[PDB]
């Protein structure tokens, strides 16, 4: 008599990535990278209406 | 006087086989086939997600 234990498979799955804007949101922002940001202290818009 | 008696006919059964992999049955499992499974003990998939 003979036996044995199988491991028979496995399966990952792709951990998969979004873009941000390889999506619909994106149209209400506008990022852009200030890459100085902290060393900015108080930033204000100026509105001539 | 002559008399008799005629046997007017007899009909056979006949039997459909089915195959199995001619259905929609089959879109649900995977088969395998493997001779060795009496001789199997065990028998783990482990998975990674």
């Known amino acids: 008599d003979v036996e ?3 491991l028979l498979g496995s399966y ?3 951990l998969s ?8 949101l994106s149209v209400a922002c ?3 990278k ?3 940001l ?3 202290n108080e930033g204000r818009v ?3 209406v």
């Open 4 to 6: 044995f234990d199988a």
């Open 12 to 14: 990952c799955n792709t």
């Open 17 to 24: 990535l979004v873009r941000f804007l390889e999506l619909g």
């Open 30 to 32: 506008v990022c852009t």
């Open 34 to 36: 200030f890459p100085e």
């Open 38 to 40: 902290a060393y900015m």
């Open 46 to 48: 100026q509105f001539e």
